Nucleic acid binder design. Structure first.
Ligand code: ZN
Ligand code: ZN
Ligand code: ZN
Lengths: 97, 182, 971, 97
DNA sequence: CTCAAGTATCGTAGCCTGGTCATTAC
DNA sequence: GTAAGCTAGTATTGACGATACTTGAG
RNA sequence: AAAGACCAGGC
């Protein structure tokens, strides 16, 4: 985006559009003799990481949720803690290329 | 609901000692928060010994857990009832020579759920109702006086509906402040 | 007896055989046909006799006798011709039967009274007995009204065989049939600071309840508070009863003395608007609690009602919510047709009396009874209500509801199947409802919680589950066979107390007590499992309310379940494929309603849950039978997000192009589409194995790769194969019909000129069969005589070859013509497609075969989709179906080299009992493929080995009815 | 609790006479009086977690660093003090400071 | 002798484009 | 002439804003 | 003609 705004701050009457019109088919023709796909291996978390996810749930999330949900709306600590466990899950799942 | 809400902030560092800002927070919370006589009443027992004498019974434990005594409750009932017989003077002439009394222990103990000793009691009576019948006296003491004596507030201010404490700190950095500090 | 020695695979085989017997015995439309059959056999006579006799006085009395209906016939000549529904479709006629009643008038013959529409495949249909006129794909259950096919949507009402406790003034209410039967007890302040007192709203007259207690015959206040049975304590209850006593004494002066309270309710009833034509004693024997005998029992029932209100007051009882389906009944064709027929029967009688009353004043001069009764009132009213959709309101008089009668769709057989299995909660302003739009846990096993519309009718229209049944009314008396299990009488003294005994209630009416309740219920249930009690009888034991409720009325939702303690009786039997009746008659299966199921521990379908721990009383047949018919057939349907399953099972399967019919020569629909070669899927769910139907699936098995294709499949586009399309994949036929009518002036003719374009027309005004009609031609020539004609022209995009021309006529003198045009389409570059997991898209590029990327055997894809569609839509089941299907169409390479190489093949993917991914990947590994599901491919344009491995496999794809050449418009 | 008339079986109202302290009972349907067994004429029943928790106060017993605090006082000590209690359910111990 | 108020009602509450039907005779 | 037999006669899913009335008391 | 009523696709 910085390169395109450089071209459209100093280059012409249509030069940013000409940049896109030359760039996009080049990128399609680059990717076409390689392919890109996704398999079942990309979607299968391991047994260890799934055990850590279930252990973090049955350790932290479920005894708290039987306390702070009985209180009223101002306790969104639930969302922060489950977001921490979701951060752990995302760090696990971004190992697949 | 949002039109009645107010956010109150606090000062900083009593004598530079640790754990002293939350103490000011509950100091003002304990000054503000409303708890009433019906929050402590359990039973209403009319007695015969002029003739009919009401016994508002209490709970001993929640008086101590909120630091209330009984002379406090006598004062906070008497000022409010004299204001309500002074403010808006019509159909409120039942408090002409009505009587109040207080005791830590009464042990009258009507038929069911006894506490046997130091069940705190706010006795009340009437003297203007010189009635030839008991059945209209029971009507006035159980359908006019006992309603207005339950909604009397004893600790806190009568106008504040709620005053709760929020830690804020929502990593929004003073969501309704603009330039105070870091 | 242990069930472990029976084994798990034996129990799975029995579950499949039992569900197959269910579908053989009942089908999928039994709930429509049973209701219509009950209305014809019983409910018609009940209407015509419950209407009552009448006498016109300016005397002449009339009485209705028995009612007969005969089969639908045609009187075209004076011959009686058999009338079939396809005749009614092609002649634009209504398919109906004649009703006769025999009247008796005195101041006696048989009079025809109307025509009632006939449901196809019912007891009046002439197709009940490869007949001429039938399709093989068809079941009954629809109506042919003015040539068009219509269906009933089932209507949900509240159950009025129980008490309803509100909380807005703290009400408790009794309802019944008659509007003069409503009885309300309210707990409120009719006014300082009054104590809450009890009031009765009977016959639009507020009465204190203590006055009604002493009017019904009670003698003392102590036995009146014995009749209420306070259960002690609760000073609010004592305060309310002494306030109601000393308020009763403040209205009548000594009501307790003889007939003072009864005289009070005389003068309180009689002073109302429109007082009833009765004294109070006959008013009490008529309009107070019908079904009870003595006034003693009515005092006892009033005490029970007040006890229920006081128990709800103290928080020991819950208020009724109308989203729990144990408080609801379902109305189908009999319940709606009875209500509609009562209105027009009253309208017939009303214009009969004011027509007779002139000629009766006018001497006898009385005619035969066929003159004074017009038969077209009933006939026109029923057909108008069918052809407009406006039924009658359930309880408002003179009003009309609108969501009752729908059109039958025939795009594929699955759309017709799911249009016949719907249920509706009608609401006032759509857009402000409570939890009506949501699944409730009392839907389990009886309504599908996954499939529903998404427009305004989201959640308000439901679909029946697969094994779901609607009960019907039991006509035999059942109350006298309750005494044989340990039930005793309700005595008449109002002085004896009944503590410890449980009350029994038959359809809401208190009929007795029972001392031991955990023997009464278990003996009634044992006598039901041996076929001497009716099979649709619901028994509910209620420990907290101390009550036994029994239901035998119509409109309850039932489902079958295994009975565990009778389950050992299979071993000793023979495993020949069963009837459902034989399994019911041995107590292995039971039909169970919503309220009885609250007393049931049901194992979750899985026999491994049942046989690893025996703390259960029942077990499911399969968990996937919790879903409707279009949702139970979806592979891995519990692996996708719920909006996607909703898209597949409510929208996309009704729009797929597949099978249409097996007799298209007599079907003049507006549009009919059909594939050239329809296929079935490779996988096998439990519902598809049990129903044994192929027309549930409409599409092809396409080989799908997940790959980028030069940027041509972005934003949910797909790329297809040119050579696969030329060999006939997704090739479609389409037939459109163009209709016109004349009176029997304008007529059919050649129009004598070329004002439009007339080339293919004959003298009659219709083309020849096999003509090639073009846009701008004249398809039907309606030559108005001596010119100025009104012909029908094809529009700017309407083409085709003439398939047939049909000429029909009516019975009232009207001619019809229909011309059908045939088109053949292969997919073009904006046609719409979708998988079975809610991934819809448009075709964006057609690629040549030799440009596609290929595998080491030469397999090229048929469809290429983009890999950006999977991390964002949450439909992982599409990858698991394709990996399963590839494993079951491949040859097993026989690394073992044994005989049974194809014995252990996994092919089910049933919802809620799917195979695990280790089984799917082991199946792919035994076939010689990588476990991850991808494989090396060579580039088609250059020949180089591509660096990325590509996911490939067969998916069942569907071609939807939204085509690109029909969306082109220009103003 | 109410009591009924002995000979008519109806509700008895208190009709304590003028000249004598008897606290009688009477019937509004018959003529029958009786001195009361009990001297209570009206017994009535009435009545027919929103307190702040800390973030970062460690426990000397456990590893939990959340211990819910409140200002209370004792029966001989005038004036209030802050009391802690550790939030884990197996802990349940209260202490000043 | 009028504000407020405690009801007493009114009336709109998703909206827009498509295609379709079926429209009381008295 | 249809008013929607008379039809109930309050006796069953909506729920808020928005405007309009019968009190006490300075 | 005009409105009702239905269905579909979007927002
Ligand atoms: Zn006392
Ligand atoms: Zn008496
Ligand atoms: Zn900690």
């Amino acid at each position: 985006n910085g390169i395109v705004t450089g071209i459209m701050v100093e280059k012409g009457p249509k030069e940013a559009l000409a940049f896109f019109d030359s760039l996009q088919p080049l990128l399609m023709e680059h990717l076409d003799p390689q392919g890109f796909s996704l398999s079942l291996e990309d979607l299968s978390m391991s047994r260890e990481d799934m055990g850590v996810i279930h252990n973090l749930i049955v350790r932290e999330i479920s005894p708290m949720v039987s306390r702070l949900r009985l209180s009223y709306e101002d306790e969104l600590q639930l969302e922060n803690s489950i977001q921490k466990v979701k951060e752990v899950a995302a760090n696990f799942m971004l190992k697949s290329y | 609901t949002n039109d009645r809400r107010v956010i109150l902030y606090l000062n900083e560092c009593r004598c530079g000692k640790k754990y002293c800002q939350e103490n000011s927070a509950y100091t003002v919370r304990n000054k503000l928060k409303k708890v009433s006589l019906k929050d402590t009443a359990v039973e209403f027992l009319v007695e015969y010994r002029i003739c009919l004498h009401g016994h508002i019974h209490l709970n001993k434990t929640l008086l101590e857990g909120w630091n209330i005594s009984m002379q406090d409750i006598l004062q906070r009932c008497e000022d409010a009832i004299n204001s309500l017989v002074q403010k808006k003077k019509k159909k409120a002439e039942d408090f002409k020579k009505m009587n109040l009394s207080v005791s830590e222990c009464c042990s009258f103990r009507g038929p069911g759920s006894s506490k046997d000793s130091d069940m705190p009691c706010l006795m009340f009576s009437s003297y203007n109702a010189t009635d030839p019948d008991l059945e209209r006296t029971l009507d006035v003491l159980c359908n006019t006086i006992y309603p207005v004596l339950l909604e009397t507030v004893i600790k806190g201010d009568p106008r504040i509906a709620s005053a709760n404490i929020i830690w804020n700190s929502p990593e929004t950095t003073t969501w309704i402040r603009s330039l105070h500090a870091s | 007896v242990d069930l472990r020695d029976l084994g798990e695979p034996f129990l799975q085989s029995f579950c499949k055989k039992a569900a197959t017997s269910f579908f053989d015995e009942y089908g999928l439309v039994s709930h429509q046909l049973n209701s219509y059959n009950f209305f014809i056999e019983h409910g018609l006579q009940s209407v015509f006799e419950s209407s009552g006799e009448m006498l016109v006085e300016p005397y002449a009395t009339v009485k209705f006798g028995e009612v007969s209906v005969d089969k639908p016939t045609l009187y075209s000549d004076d011959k009686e011709l058999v009338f079939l529904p396809w005749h009614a479709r092609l002649q634009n006629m209504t398919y109906s039967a004649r009703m006769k009643v025999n009247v008796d008038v005195e101041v006696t013959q048989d009079i025809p009274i109307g025509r009632i529409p006939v449901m196809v495949k019912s007891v009046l249909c002439n197709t009940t007995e490869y007949r001429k006129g039938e399709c093989a794909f068809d079941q009954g259950g629809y109506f042919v009204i003015k040539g068009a096919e219509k269906v009933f949507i089932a209507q949900e009402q509240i159950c009025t065989k129980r008490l309803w406790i509100s909380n807005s003034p703290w009400t408790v209410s009794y309802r019944s049939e008659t509007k003069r039967n409503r009885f309300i007890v309210r707990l409120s302040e009719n006014q300082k600071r009054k104590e809450k007192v009890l009031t009765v709203y009977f016959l639009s007259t507020e009465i204190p309840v203590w006055v009604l207690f002493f009017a019904l015959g009670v003698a003392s206040d102590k036995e009146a508070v014995d009749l209420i049975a306070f259960d002690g304590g609760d000073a609010s209850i004592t305060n309310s009863v002494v306030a109601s006593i000393q308020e009763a004494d403040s209205v009548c002066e000594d009501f307790r003395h003889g007939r003072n309270a009864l005289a009070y309710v005389e003068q309180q009833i009689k002073g109302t608007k429109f007082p009833p034509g009765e004294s109070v004693d006959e008013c009490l024997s008529l309009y107070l609690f019908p079904g009870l005998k003595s006034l003693t029992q009515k005092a006892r029932f009033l005490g029970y009602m007040v006890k229920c209100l006081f128990s709800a007051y103290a928080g020991k009882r819950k208020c009724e919510n109308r989203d729990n389906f144990r408080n609801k009944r379902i109305e189908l064709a009999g319940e709606l047709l009875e209500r509609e027929l009562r209105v027009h029967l009253a309208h017939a009688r009303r214009t009969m009396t004011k027509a007779m009353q002139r000629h009766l004043t006018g001497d006898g001069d009385l005619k035969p009874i066929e003159h004074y009764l017009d038969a077209s009132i009933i006939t026109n009213g029923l057909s108008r209500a069918f052809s407009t959709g406006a039924w009658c309101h359930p309880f408002r008089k003179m009003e009309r509801v609108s969501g009752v009668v729908a059109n039958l769709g025939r795009a594929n057989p699955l759309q017709s199947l799911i249009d016949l299995r719907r249920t509706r909660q009608q609401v006032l302003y759509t857009g402000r409802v409570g939890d009506a739009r949501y699944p409730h846990p009392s839907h389990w096993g009886r309504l599908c919680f996954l499939s529903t519309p998404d427009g305004e009718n989201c959640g308000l229209v439901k679909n029946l589950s697969l094994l779901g049944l609607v009960s019907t009314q039991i006509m035999e008396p059942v109350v006298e066979e309750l005494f044989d299990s340990g039930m005793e009488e309700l005595m008449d003294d109002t002085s004896t107390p009944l503590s410890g005994k449980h009350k029994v209630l038959l359809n809401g009416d208190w009929v007795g007590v029972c001392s031991d309740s955990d023997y009464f219920v278990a003996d009634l249930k044992s006598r039901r499992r041996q076929s001497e009690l009716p099979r649709q009888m619901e028994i509910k034991l209620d420990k907290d309310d101390k009550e036994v409720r029994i239901f035998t009325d119509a409109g309850r939702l039932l489902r079958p379940l295994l009975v565990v303690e009778n389950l050992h009786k299979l071993k000793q039997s023979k495993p020949s494929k069963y009837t459902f009746e034989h399994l019911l008659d041995q107590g292995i299966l039971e039909l169970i309603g919503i309220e009885e199921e609250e007393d049931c521990t049901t194992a979750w379908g899985t026999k491994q849950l049942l046989k690893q721990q025996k703390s259960y009383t029942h077990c499911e047949l399969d968990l996937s039978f919790l879903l409707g018919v279009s949702c139970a057939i979806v592979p891995f349907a519990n692996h996708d997000h719920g909006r996607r399953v909703l898209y597949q099972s409510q929208k996309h399967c009704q729009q797929a192009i597949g099978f249409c019919s097996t007799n298209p020569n007599i079907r003049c629909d507006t549009l009919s589409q059909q594939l050239f070669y329809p296929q079935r899927p490779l996988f096998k769910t439990m519902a598809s194995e049990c129903l044994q139907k192929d027309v549930l699936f409409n599409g092809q098995n396409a080989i799908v790769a997940v790959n980028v294709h030069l940027g041509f499949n972005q934003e949910d586009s797909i790329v297809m194969n040119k050579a696969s399309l030329e060999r006939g994949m997704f090739r479609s036929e389409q037939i459109r019909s163009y209709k016109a009518d004349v009176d029997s002036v304008v007529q059919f003719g050649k129009t004598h000129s070329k004002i439009g374009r007339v080339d293919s027309l004959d003298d009659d005004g219709f083309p020849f069969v096999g003509a090639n009609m073009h846009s701008g031609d004249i398809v039907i020539g309606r030559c108005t005589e001596s010119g100025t004609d009104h012909s029908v022209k094809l529009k700017h995009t309407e083409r085709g070859i003439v398939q047939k021309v049909v000429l029909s006529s009516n019975d009232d003198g009207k001619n019809y013509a229909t011309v059908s045009l045939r088109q053949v389409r292969s997919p073009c570059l904006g046609d719409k497609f979708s998988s079975m997991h809610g991934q819809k898209g448009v075709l964006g590029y057609i690629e040549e075969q030799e440009n596609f990327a290929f595998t080491n055997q030469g397999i090229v894809p048929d469809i290429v989709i983009n890999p950006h569609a999977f991390p964002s839509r949450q439909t992982p089941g599409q990858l698991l179906e394709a990996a399963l299907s590839k494993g079951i169409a491949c040859p097993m390479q026989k690394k073992k080299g044994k005989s049974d190489a194809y014995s252990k093949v996994t092919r089910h993917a049933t919802p809620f009992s799917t195979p695990s991914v280790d089984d799917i990947t082991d199946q792919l590994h035994r076939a010689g493929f990588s476990r991850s599901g991808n494989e090396r491919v060579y580039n088609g344009r250059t020949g180089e080995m591509m660096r990325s491995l590509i996911f490939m496999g067969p998916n069942f794809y569907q071609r939807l009815i939204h085509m690109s050449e029909d969306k082109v418009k220009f103003r | 609790t109410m009591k009924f008339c002995r000979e008519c079986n109806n509700i008895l109202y208190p009709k304590e006479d003028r000249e004598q302290s008897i606290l009688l009972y009477a019937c509004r349907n018959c003529d029958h009086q009786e001195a009361a067994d009990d001297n209570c004429v009206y017994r009535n029943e009435v009545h027919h977690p929103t307190l702040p928790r800390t973030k970062a106060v460690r426990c000397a017993k456990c590893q939990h660093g959340e211990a819910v605090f409140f200002q209370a006082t004792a029966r001989g000590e005038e004036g209030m003090t802050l009391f802690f209690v550790c939030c884990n359910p197996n802990c349940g111990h209260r202490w000043r400071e």
